[PDB]
């Protein structure tokens, strides 16, 4: 079957859902209308120790977003989290 990672995004739980909301505003504080863009993601990239170009993150936003905005919204941010969070089974 398909849509396995998004199924958890739609359901999930308030404990993890509200957590993505609290971890989303800090990621995008001044990006367009509250959407994590290449510049916002690059800010956290420097904390790890790497400073890639805006194109590196532009590919990341295209893989999880394709609605025309080209920016990680609250849903796309939480959807990208479960992708690398794996499942419980």
């Amino acid at each position: 079957m398909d849509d396995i990672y998004k199924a958890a995004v739609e359901q999930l739980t308030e404990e993890q859902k509200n957590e993505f909301k609290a971890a989303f505003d800090i990621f995008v504080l001044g990006a367009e209308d509250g959407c994590i863009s290449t510049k916002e993601l690059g800010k956290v990239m420097r904390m790890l120790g790497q400073n890639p170009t805006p194109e590196e993150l532009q590919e990341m936003i295209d893989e999880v977003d394709e609605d025309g905005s080209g920016t990680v919204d609250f849903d796309e941010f939480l959807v990208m989290m479960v992708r690398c969070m794996k499942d419980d089974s």
């Binding site: 990621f27 956290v44 790890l48 590196e56 989290m81 479960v82 690398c84 969070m85």
Partner: peptide, 20 residues
């Protein structure tokens, strides 16, 4: 290439690495 981020890893650096 050293480009990879995890949910817990990014969260720990978001509200932990010089943040909280």
């Amino acid at each position: 290439r050293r480009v990879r981020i995890s949910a817990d890893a990014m969260m720990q650096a978001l509200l932990g690495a010089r943040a909280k």
